[PDB]
Design a protein around this ligand. Structure first.
Ligand SMILES: N[C@@H](CCC(=O)N[C@@H](CS)C(=O)NCC(=O)O)C(=O)O
Ligand SMILES: N[C@@H](CCC(=O)N[C@@H](CS)C(=O)NCC(=O)O)C(=O)O
Ligand SMILES: [Ca+2]
Ligand SMILES: [Os+3]
Ligand SMILES: [Os+3]
Lengths: 240, 241
């Protein structure tokens, strides 16, 4: 059954699913959608929520811009990650041990419930960075301190999280986001300090896998794509 | 055979999720109440460093819940616990086996967590406008199978994730609990009784009728009283827009 992923280069949520599809060894199509500036009028047929990513599964082979009513329509990136693990059990995208699987699910929930909203506050509103650094230290603490991925072996938990952490460093270097230069310097200094050595190792380890290289446009190219995001307000910063 | 201990509180819809799943699994388990919002025990960070309910311990030697063992696995986050219980009890069929039906369950949980839950929190605790909550609830209702049944068809952990919040909404509205305005209270009570929301009313009745709900619910009046102990539900305060 065919897999089509509707994607966009700037989107960390879409990036999650591309990484998982690479790790699964899946056959799949990607189709870019200019969702924030010029959504195609047919896109609500694949996702009535009008969000990227969207996925179609099965149905007749059709061009991505002529989606079939017969394909299954799957929404929400984390549901897609679990779906890919279910479709490709031999790829071991989750552990088999229940406790190790729970480490993976807990890590995803920690990111979604405590970290992502802090990234949104800082990058979209320019609120103070300390709560974000606090949340990142908490997430770092859930990693195995001596090395490895969130659940030991690589799992969909790492697909869920690396798109956001990998964007953080080059976005900061570009000063992209509503935070002030002062908070930018503070974040860059903190993320380079020994306080965050472990999460730097995590980002390197995830980025070294082919699933990341094959789904990443390059730091400079990803920064340029992010500048097209309306809510990142390129050129704008809030102060105090 | 490994022991399960769930640290719980009657008001908490997040802990309620996990009690429902444990009932559906037929698991042997212990519950232990924790006064997390008014008087957290000094030992509680040993079972959850995030200092949130629910918390779960798994395995380790059998010990009293207020003397937790370092040897037990410490599991945090209610939705992680739901998937864990499905993993521990595969014969209970707490998820479908078909991948697309399983994705329906996972998508339903994500729709609730990402678009509905924050609206419930903001309307009840901050008194933000009710219309965005009603729109999110209409969207969630549209994900249900139209002719009846549960989120993924057969009952699954997706329904354990969602019913604690929907089941509290109706009696909380009737008891006037929450910081939203009188006007928005009237609007929500009318909407939730209107034909627009017939499908989600059937869904709530269907989930509540299962023994897993009856055996984990203190009764409407009792749950309302437990909710009044929540410090953020400041009696006599309302926000207006
Ligand atoms: N919870 C969703 C988030 C998806 C999301 O927010 N995608 C953004 C792009 S990064 C989008 O399409 N926004 C359009 C909109 O929200 O209207 C998921 O995990 O897939
Ligand atoms: N995302 C958590 C939410 C848990 C949560 O917020 N629990 C509340 C009780 S309903 C709590 O323990 N609050 C204490 C605190 O935030 O300090 C989960 O799904 O388990
Ligand atoms: Ca529908
Ligand atoms: Os975005
Ligand atoms: Os709470």
């Amino acid at each position: 059954k065919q897999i089509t992923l509707y994607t966009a280069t700037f989107s960390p949520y879409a990036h999650r699913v591309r990484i998982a599809l690479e790790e699964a060894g899946a056959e799949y199509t990607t189709y870019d959608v200019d969702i924030l500036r010029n959504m195609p009028d047919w896109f609500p047929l694949v996702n009535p929520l009008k969000k990227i990513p969207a996925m179609t599964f099965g149905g007749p082979e059709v061009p991505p811009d002529q989606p079939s009513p017969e394909s299954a329509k799957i929404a929400e990136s984390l549901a897609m990650l679990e779906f890919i693990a279910d479709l490709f059990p031999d790829a071991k995208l989750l552990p088999t041990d229940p406790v190790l699987r729970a480490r993976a699910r807990t890590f995803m929930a920690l990111y979604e419930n405590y970290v992502n909203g802090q990234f949104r506050d800082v990058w979209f509103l320019g609120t103070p960075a300390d709560p974000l650094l606090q949340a990142l230290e908490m997430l770092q603490g859930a990693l195995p301190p001596d090395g490895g991925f969130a659940a030991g072996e690589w799992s969909i938990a790492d697909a869920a999280v690396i798109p956001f952490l990998a964007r953080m460093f080059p976005y900061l270097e570009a000063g992209l986001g509503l935070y002030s230069k002062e908070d930018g310097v503070k974040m860059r200094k903190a993320m380079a300090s020994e306080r965050f050595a472990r999460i730097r190792q995590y980002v390197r380890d995830c980025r070294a896998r082919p699933s990341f290289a094959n789904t990443w446009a390059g730091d400079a190219e990803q920064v340029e794509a992010a500048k097209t995001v309306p809510m990142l307000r390129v050129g704008e910063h809030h102060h105090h």
